[model samples]
Target: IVGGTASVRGEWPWQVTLHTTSPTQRHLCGGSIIGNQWILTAAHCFYGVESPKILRVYSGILNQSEIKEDTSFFGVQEIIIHDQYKMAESGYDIALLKLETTVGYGDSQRPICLPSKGDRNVIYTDCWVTGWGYRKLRDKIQNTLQKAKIPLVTNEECQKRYRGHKITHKMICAGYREGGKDACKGDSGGPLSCKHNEVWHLVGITSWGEGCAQRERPGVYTNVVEYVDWILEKTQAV
Candidate 1:
C-alpha cells in the first residue's frame, strides 16, 4: 500500500494472503473473507496463472515472514472469475474463490459484509484499503500489513484525468488528486472496505492504477455493489 503505515494485528479480520505452493510459499495477492468457504478478490490476479493446486490461502496473520499458530491455511476448491473481466480493459475485475475447507471464525478472523441487495449504489465517503505491498513503486514489499485511508473520487472526474482509461460503472476510484496514497504492486485483489454506521462493508476490490500514488491518478477498484447477485450465485452454487 502506498502512503500507508503498518497495520495492527486483528485490525482487519477479513484480510487474507493468497500464496503459491510450499517450495517458495510466496504471497501473490490479498483477499477478503466473504464467508467460511468463500473469498473475494481481483480476477486479473489469476487470469493466466498456473494451477489451483499450486495456490493456497492464509488468514488471521499480519506478518508474512513470521510463522504463527493463529494463522490458518486452506486449499482452493475452485476459482470463479467474472465473465467480462478483460485484462486490457478496466471494469469487472473481480473473482470469487471457494476454499477446500471452511475457515473458522475468531476474534481475529471473520467475514466482511458485502453490500445488501436492497441497498442502492452506496457511496462510501470514508473508506480504507489494506494489504502488504510496497510503500512506493520500486520499493521492497512490506512484511507487515499496511493500510491507507483513501477518499472516494467520482468516475467522471477520474475519466477526465485518465482520458485513455475507461472508467466504467462497474468500477470506483479513490485517492488524492495531487497524489500521495494508493495500492501499489502486490496489493492487488485486496479489499477496499468502507464502514457504514458500525458494520464494515466490502465495497470494492483493488483493480488498476496508473502508478502508485501518481498525480491525478487514483486507484480504480471493482465495484462490489454492482455484482452482489453474481457473488451470491457463485457462493451458493457450492
Candidate 2:
C-alpha cells in the first residue's frame, strides 16, 4: 500500500491481478490464487462482458504495471461463475477461474487456505485487503499493491450501517466505522484475509461498496467461507 507503504515482495503470494484482454491490457479487478490452477474472484467482474477469453490472470508481481522476468501471466481455461449469482442484486458474487496451466507456488506465488467446511465463526476480526487500487479516495489506481488493516463488521452492524442495502448471509463487510482506511475502485474482486492459528484464511472476496472509505459505508465482499464447498466442487481448491 502506498498509504501503508509498499508491500514486501511475496508478502501476499496469493494476490493476483485481473486484466482484460485489450490492447491496453487494463487492470479491471483483483483476485486470490486459491489453487495452483484456480483463482477466486467476484462474479460481477464479468457481468455482461462477452468472450471469457478476453481476460487474463497475472501473479508473482508486486506492482501491476511493472512485471519482472519471473512474473506469471496465465490464460483462462474456464470461468465458472456462481450459478445463483445475480448482478442486479447483492450477495452470491463469487466466481472461479481455471488457468490453462499450473503456476509455481512459492514465495512470489501461492494459495491461501480456505475456511474449513463447518467453520463459521469469523466476525469482528482484524483482516487485511491487498490490491493495486487507488492510493487515496477518488484518485487514480496505483501500480504498486496497497494494503489496509480493516476490521470485519458483524452482519447486524453492517446491515445497520447500510440501511437500504441488504447485507445477506453470503456477504461480509469490513472497514473502519470512522472511515479512514478501505479498499477502493480497481480493487474489486480482491482478497480480504485474516490469519487464524498462524494460517491465513480468505474471509471475504471484494464485491461492492457505496463510496470508498466513507463514514459508515464499509466495503462489502463475498463471504469466502460461505462458498467453500461450492469452490471446492468447482475447482480443485480446498
Candidate 3:
C-alpha cells in the first residue's frame, strides 16, 4: 500500500496472503477471510492461474518470510470468479476461494463480517485497508503488511475524477483527493474494512486504479455491501 505504515501482527486477522504453490511460493494478491473456508479476493489475481492446486493461502501472517513456518497455510479446493468479471477496468472484479479445510479461528486468524444490504448507501468512517502490496509504483511488494486509513469518495465525485471511465454502483472509491494513500499493485483482493458499532465490516475489495496513489485518482474496490446477497448464495450453495 502506498503511504502506509507497517501493521502489527494479528492487527487485521481477516487479512491473508495469496501465493502460487511453487517452491518459492510467490505472493500474488491479498485476500480476506470471509468464512472458515471461504476467501474473498480480486478475480484479476488469477489471470494466468490454471487450477486451484496452483494456489495457496497463508493466514495469520504479518510478514512474507513467516510463511515458511506458518502452519496456517491452506490449499484451495475451488475458485469462483464473478461471471461478469471480464477485466479490472470494467468492474465486477471479485472472486471467492473455498479452502480444502476449515481454518481455525484465533486471535490472529478469523473471518470478517460482511456488510448487509442496508449498508449499500451508508457512508462509513474509521475505515482502513491493509495489504502487502507495493509501497510505490516501481517498488517491489512489501514483505511486511501495511495499513492505511483512507476516506471514502462519493460515486459522483469519483466519477468526475475518472471521467469517461465507467464507475458502476458495484464499485466504491476511497482515498485522499490529494493522493498519497491507497492500495496498489499486488494489493488486489484485499479488504477495505470499516468499523460499525465497534465491529469491523468488510466494505470493499481492492480492484483497480489509474496508478499507485495518483492525485485525483483514488483506488476502486468491489462494493461488498452491494454483493452480500450474491456472496451468501454462492457460499451457501455448496
Q: How much is 232 displaced in model 3, in angstroms? A: 0.9
Tell me how far the alpha carbon of residue 109 in candidate 2 is from the true structure, in angstroms, after superposition: 0.3
Number of colliding residue pairs in each model: 0, 2, 0
Estimate the overall C-alpha local distance difference test score of candidate 3.
0.92
Candidate 1: 10-residue stretch with minimal lDDT: 65-74
1-238, model 2: which lDDT tens digit per residue?
A: 2135578888889999988866566887899999889999998888755766888788887876575435457989888989988872467898888999998878888999988865586443658988988766668878788888888888899999888888897888888888877788788888998887778988889888877888898789898888988987887545
lDDT, candidate 3, 91-131, per-residue tens: 88889999999999999999999997777767798999899
Give the CA lDDT, 0 to 100, for residue 128 in model 1. 97
Query: Sorted on TM-score, highest at the top, how do the candidates line up?
Result: 3, 1, 2
Relative to the unseen true structure, what is the C-alpha lDDT of residue 178 in candidate 1, on a scale of 0 to 100? 90
State the displacement of the C-alpha of residue 119, model 1, in Å, after optimal TM-score superposition: 3.9
Top candidate when judged by TM-score against the true structure: 3
- Kindly provide the TM-score of model 1 when superposed on the true structure, using C-alpha atoms: 0.94
The collision pairs in model 1 are none
- Lowest-scoring 10 consecutive residues by lDDT in candidate 3? 64-73
TM-score of 3: 0.97
Q: Global CA lDDT of candidate 2, please?
A: 0.82
